[PDB]
Symmetry: D3
Subunit: 224 residues, 6 copies
C-alpha cells in the first residue's frame, strides 16, 4: 500500500526494529521472533511482524544511507502507524577509547543536506528520543553489558573525500559513524512518534556483539 | 574483498548493469544473462557475472539513494576495475509530455550535498558519458523504441517537503526524477571510467517497458 | 586571568550555574549559596563561588546570545577547569502543550547561528546536552515534585526574528522552546571533554500571547542536580 | 527593443553564434557571413545577421562572464525568438592531455557562480548543452577532419582565481577546460525551451605555461553545425 | 516597555552612546553627563539619560556579540524612537601599523554571523556606517586634536576564533580591527531609517599582541568618549 | 601586457574613470580629455590616456557584471599600478524619491555573487567605497552645484532577477539603486592598497519605472562625468 511496502495498516507492530542489511533482518526473524510472519519483500526488504515475550515486535531492513531510511521510516510512521523505530546496526569508531563495543546514540550529526531542506537551512539537532535512549541504557544495564552513550555522525559518504573530518569528529568526542540516524530522528519528531539507535562497532575508522546488541534492543522494545 | 562485496578482482565484467531493486537484478539474471554466476550476496545485493551475445556482462542492485550507489559504484570502478556502469531503473515524470516512456539522462541535478563535498562547494555538473548516452540512443533507435533524452533530478528525499520544486523542475524542462544518477556520474569521472542511465517511467509526479529498457541497455552494453 | 574574567584558578567550583542576566546571578548567589564570594565582576557579569548543602557551587552571568556564552563557557572549561555548566534560563514556549512558567529541560538545541558550522566543516553538528546532566536534572525534578518537560530547544541569533514562519515550523517538529544560548554551550563542552546542560522556565509563549515560583522551582532543580553530579 | 539590444523582431536569425569579444564577432561577420547587416551595436556589442551557404545566421558578442551572457542570452531567446545559440569561444585547458589550440566541445559546464543556485532553490542544477547541438558539433567536426574533444567545462566567475587548488581538483575529475560563460547560457535555454551549446579553442593551459588556424577551425565547425541544425 | 528595557518613550534621548560593557556605560554617564538619570537597569545594562554641553545624550550598554546589540538597537529605534546610535567600544587590532590605545573609526564591517544573510535573502548585505556619523566622528577627532584611522571592521561571532587563517586574510584586505557588534548594528539603523556609527579604541592586537587590562579597558579609554560626544553635538 | 590589455605600465594614468559601456568611455575621452591617446582596445574596450585641467586621467570600459570588472580592476591595480578607480555608470533605482537622471554616490554595495564569499572564507565582506573618494565625489558635486544622494548600492549578477521579492527587501533597508559591478570593484582596491569609488546616474527605476533610451543612457549623462573628473582632480 506504499510504493516500497506491500503490507497493510495493521501488518506492522507498534514497535519495529530496523537494520541496514536485509539478510540481517531475516537472521533475527528467525532468531528471536516467535511466529515470524513475512509482511514485506518488495526490493527484498525483509519485513516481519512477530512477538517477543508475548509483545508484538517487527523487524525490517532500511537500506544503507539517509535517503533510504527516510523512505521506510516516513512510511512506517505515517501509513503503518508505527510508534517506535529502533535502528539496531553497526557503525565505525571515532573515539580512541571505543573498540570493535556497543554505542547508544543520543543524537547524530550529519553531512547530508536533508535536515537543512526540512528546516529552512538552519541547524536541526537530530536527537534520539530520551524515552528510547533511557530504555536502551537501562536494559544494557540489567543484562550487564557495557554500552557507550553519546553522539553519532551520519555520513552521506562511506569513502569520505574529506579526510580531515575523522580527526575533527574525534576532537569533539563523537562516538562513531554510520549512515542513517540523522535521517530517522527528525522524521520521528515530525510524526510525534519516537526513534532511537544502537549500536555495535564493526571496525575503527582511526586505525557476541550482534547477540548483546539485540538482547538490549529487544529488552528495551519491551519497556517502551 | 570490500565490506559490501565478497567477490574478487575479475569476478566482475568490465560492464555492469545496476538497478535499485535487488530482486530486479535477479529477474535479469535470470532473463538475459547466459551462465548467471552469483558473485555477491552481501546485504542480499544480488551480484551476477554472465554473457550476452558472447560478451561478459554483470548485473547488481545498488540500493535506493546517492549514498548507497556511491558505495557500490566507487568499489566496482576501483577494486573490481569496472569500465562502465549503466543504471537501468525507474523514475518519475516531471515533463508534461512524458508518460508512464523511456527517458535517457544526459545529466542529473540534485538536492544532495555529496557533489558539493567533492567539489569545494561549487556546482559540479553531474554528466552521463557522451559515449554511453550515444550508445543508448542509438540502440533505442535500432530496436525502434522511442526514448526521451535529457536532464534528470536525483532527489535525496522521495517525499519532498519542498513541494514548490516539481513545478520548478518542470519550468526548466527536467525530464524525470530518481535518486541515484547524480551520485554515479562523478564517481565515473573520478576513476576515468564511464557511466550512464536509463530509464523508465513508473509514475508521473505532476498528476513491456521493463523489456524495452533492458534490450536497449543490453544492445548498448555491446557497442561500449 | 582572562580578558573577561578576573578570577584565578581555584576560584570557580567544578560546577557553574550560568544565566543570561547578571543580576539574576547575583540574586542566586545571595539566595541559594552560602558564603558567596564575588570572584569575577568584569563587565558587571557577577560571578560567585560558595556552597550549597556542603557542596561547592558557582554562579555567573553569560550575557545574551551564542557569541557571549561562547566567550564565557570556553574560558571556564579551559582556563578555570570547570567540569559542568548548567544554564538556568528563561525561554519562549513553542510546542502548544507548554505553558508559561512550565519548566523545560533540554536534550539538545537547534540553531540559526553559523558558529557550529564554522566549528564543524560546514556540516550539521548536533548540539546535545550531556546525558548525565539531563538525567540529573530529571531526577532532581522528580525528587522535588516539580514537573519538567524534556525535549529539543532552539537558540536563535535573532530575538525579533524576521523569519516569521519559523515558529510554526519548529512547532511542527515538536521543539519545546526558544532561547538564545544552549546551541553554543553544548559543543564547547564536548570540545573540552566536559559536561553541559540547560534548564529553563517559560516566560512567554511565541505561538500565542501569554513567576518567582517558577524561577524558584527551576533553581532548586538545578542546584539539587548539581549536588548529584558532584 | 531592449535596453541592451536595438534590433527588432525578425532582425536575428534562429541560430545565433556568440563569442565574448565583440571585435571577434565583427571578424566573423566580415569573414563568414555574406551580406552582414549590423542589427545591434548597443554598448559596442556588434550583432550581425547574414547568411552562410544560403542558411540564415547571426553573430553577436556577449561580454565576459555569466552575468553578461545572462543578459544577452535571455533577451535573444525571449524578445527575439532565437532557437539556438552556439558559444564560440576560447578557454584555458585543464586536462593534461589537452593542448593549446586544441578544440573542445562542451557536454556541460560546472561553475562557481551563485546564479544557478538562485535560479534553482539552492540546489545543484546541471548546466548541460543540448544533445542535438553537441551532436551537430561532433558531426561537423568529423565531416571536416578537425579533431575535437568532448567533455565537461567549467565557467569561473574569477579569471584570476584566488582558489589555487581548484585547477588540480578539476583535473582530478577530468574537466577539459575553463571559460567564463557556458554555465549561464545552458540553463537559460532550458528555461525558454530553446537549445544551446558551446565550442572552444584552447588558448592557454592552466596547469602549465603554453592561433588563427584554430580559430578558423572552430568557426567552420560551428557554422557547419549551425547549417545541420536548421 | 520592552522585555529588556523598562523605560518609556521619551526617557531616552535621540542620540545614544553604547558599549558592550555596562560598567563602561556607567563611567561615561558619571564622567561626562550633567544630571544623569538612570533610565534603564534591567539585566544591569546601565542606561542613562543626561545632557552634554546643553544637548540631550544617553548612554547604555549593549552586551557582547551581534545577537545582543541587535536586541537593544532594534528596541531603541523602534520603541524609544532613537535617531542616532554611536557605538564606542574596543577592538581588535589587525593592521600592523595600529597599536593599543589607538583610535579607529569604522566605515563598515564584515561579519561571520548568518544574521545579515537571514535578514537579506541570504546575499551579501554591506553593513555600512552612516556617512554623516562617520564624518562627524572624523571631524570631532580632528578638532579635539586626536589621531584616528578610518576603515573597515569585522564583527566576529567567535572571540576565540577556530579559523586561525582568517586574521591574515583580513590583513591582506586591509581591515583595521576586529570587534563583535557593528555588523549587527548598521543594517538595523538602515531598517529604521535611523543613523549609526562606530568608534573603538584598540584593546589588544591579533597579529603581534600586545594586550590591555580589564581596568584600563574599562576606565582608561576616554578620548573615544570625547570624540563620540563632540560628534554627537554636531549630529 | 595582460591578456585583456595590450598597453604597458606607464600608459595608464594613476586615476582611471571606468564604465560598462566602452562607447561611453569613448564619449568621455572625446568630450573631456585634452590629447587622448588610445592606450588599449583589445575586445573593443576603449581605453584612453589624456589629461584634464592639466592632470593625467584615463578612461576605459569595464564590461557588465562582477566577473568582468574584476578582470580589469585587478590588471589595472596590479600590472598598470593604478592608484584610483572611479566607476561612473548607471543604475538601478530602488528608492522611491529617486528618479531617472538623478545622481547617486555609493558608500558600499551588497551583492549576490559568490565572489566575495570566495575571496573571504565564505563570510560577509563589506564591499566599501574608499572614504577619500566618496568625499571627493561628494565635494565636487557640491561645488559644480549638482544634487547627489549618498548611500548603498547592490550589485546583482542577474539583471533579469528571478527573485522578484528582492527589490522590496532592498527598499526596506533603504538601498539607493542597483547596478552590476561595484561589489566586485571595492574588495579588489582593498586587496591592492589602492582606492575605488562609484558614482552612477539613474537610468531606469525598478519599483515604478520609468525608463531611459540606449542613446540617452550612452551620451546624455555628462554631469556624473563632470563630478567624477572634478573629484579626480582633488584625489
Ligand atoms: N566505517 C563506517 N563508516 C560509515 N558507515 C559505517 C557502517 C554502517 N554500515 C553500513 C555501511 O558499511 C551503513 O548502513 C552504516 O550505517 C559501519 N561501519 C561504517
Ligand atoms: N516519483 C519518484 N520520485 C523519486 N524516485 C523515484 C523512483 C526511483 N525508484 C526508487 C524509489 O521509489 C529510487 O531508486 C528512484 O531511483 C521511481 N519513481 C520515483
Ligand atoms: N521568547 C523568547 N525568544 C527568544 N529568547 C528568549 C529568552 C531568553 N532570554 C534572553 C532574551 O529575552 C536571552 O538570553 C534568551 O536566552 C526568553 N524568552 C525568549
Ligand atoms: N585560461 C582561462 N581562464 C578563464 N577564462 C578563459 C577564457 C575565456 N576568455 C575570456 C577571458 O579570458 C572569458 O570570456 C573566458 O570565457 C579563455 N581562456 C581562459
Ligand atoms: N581580539 C578581539 N576579538 C574580538 N572582539 C574583540 C573586542 C571587542 N570587545 C568585546 C569583548 O572582547 C567584544 O564586545 C568585542 O566587541 C576587543 N578585542 C577583540
Ligand atoms: N535595473 C538595473 N538592474 C541592474 N543593473 C542595472 C544597471 C547597470 N547598467 C548595466 C546594464 O544594465 C550594468 O552594467 C549595470 O551596472 C542600470 N540599470 C540596472
Amino acid at each position: 500500500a506504499t510504493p516500497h511496502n506491500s503490507a497493510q495498516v495493521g501488518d506492522f507492530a507498534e514497535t519495529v526494529l530496523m537494520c541496514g542489511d536485509p539478510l540481517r533482518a531475516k537472521l533475527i526473524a528467525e532468531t528471536y521472533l516467535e511466529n515470524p510472519k513475512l509482511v514485506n519483500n518488495v526490493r527484498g526488504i525483509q519485513g516481519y511482524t512477530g512477538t517477543y515475550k508475548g509483545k508484538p515486535i517487527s523487524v525490517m531492513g532500511h537500506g544503507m544511507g539517509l535517503p533510504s531510511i527516510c523512505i521506510y521510516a516516513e512510511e512506517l510512521y505515517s501509513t503503518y502507524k508505527v510508534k517506535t523505530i529502533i535502528r539496531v546496526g553497526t557503525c565505525g569508531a571515532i573515539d580512541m577509547d571505543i573498540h570493535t563495543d556497543i554505542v547508544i546514540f543520543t543524537s547524530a550529526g550529519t553531512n547530508s543536506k536533508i535536515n537543512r531542506i526540512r528546516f529552512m537551512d538552519h541547524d536541526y539537532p537530530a536527537t534520539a528520543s530520551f524515552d528510547v535512549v533511557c530504555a536502551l541504557v537501562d536494559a544494557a544495564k540489567e543484562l550487564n553489558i557495557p554500552a557507550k552513550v553519546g553522539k553519532g555522525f551520519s555520513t552521506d559518504l562511506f569513502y569520505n573525500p574529506q579526510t580531515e573530518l575523522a580527526q575533527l569528529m574525534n576532537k569533539f568526542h563523537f562516538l562513531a559513524v554510520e549512515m542513517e540516524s540523522a535521517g530517522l530522528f527528525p522524521i520521528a519528531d515530525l510524526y510525534g512518534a519516537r526513534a532511537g539507535c544502537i549500536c555495535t562497532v564493526s571496525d575503527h575508522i582511526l586505525h557476541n556483539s550482534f547477540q548483546n546488541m539485540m538482547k538490549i534492543a529487544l529488552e528495551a522494545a519491551i519497556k517502551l
